């Protein structure tokens, strides 16, 4: 049952990968807004970062169900 | 035949997504207390960060059992 | 009997997971380098970098998902 | 014979929970280090964060083997 092994395991590496690509975009945004906080140090920019991360996990939550 | 492959793969993708988003809920706290230590330079908030990552991680470990 | 197959298969599941997460960790570690750069210096040129770097990380990740 | 699937799912659930906790450890290390370079902006901490990130990725590299 190697067709089973091959199909299943190659497809799986694919999905782990894609999901990562997404958690990476998000993280990216977290990093850029975080850099903005670094440059300015603004409770404002921090509430911004909060709202972002919140919409990001809103997105993930969404996707994880399907 | 293939219908079983289908079912297994989907449950797999889901599991990934669940685990990832749980990580993202964690990354969240980590980012925001990080932004705090950015803004106030707190040695106390440094401790708060260390403490919170410690416990967050332990709460990560306790899922793998099962 | 069955247990043999099952074992091998889970094994390579854990394998592919380990490999892809080490890749994400390499991306993240670059991210941390330029981010700390911003911490110590606070030059915005560095924010232009960081943008470019995240972008090419997610770029290559899309590129890998496309086997 | 769905019980095959049953075992397989529990196992993978496990496997992934675990791989994520191993990466999370090194992130925590990197966050301890980053917070301390925030307080004290020393190239010392800089080069030393490089070293730790390094230990982590290689630990995980050999691990795939």
Numbering used by the authors:
A (entry chain A), B (entry chain C): 4 to 69
C (entry chain D): 3 to 69
D (entry chain B): 4 to 68
Give the exact sentences the study uses for this entry.
Here we use deep network hallucination to generate a wide range of symmetric protein homo-oligomers given only a specification of the number of protomers and the protomer length. Starting from only a choice of chain length L and oligomer valency N (2 for a dimer, 3 for a trimer, etc.), the method carries out a Monte Carlo search in sequence space starting from a random sequence. To eliminate such over-fitting, we generated new sequences for the HAL backbones using the recently developed ProteinMPNN sequence design neural network (accompanying manuscript: Dauparas et al.).
To evaluate design accuracy we attempted crystallization of 19 designs and succeeded in solving crystal structures for seven (three C2s, two C3s and two C4s). Despite its simple topology, the closest structural homologue to this design has a TM-score of only 0.59.
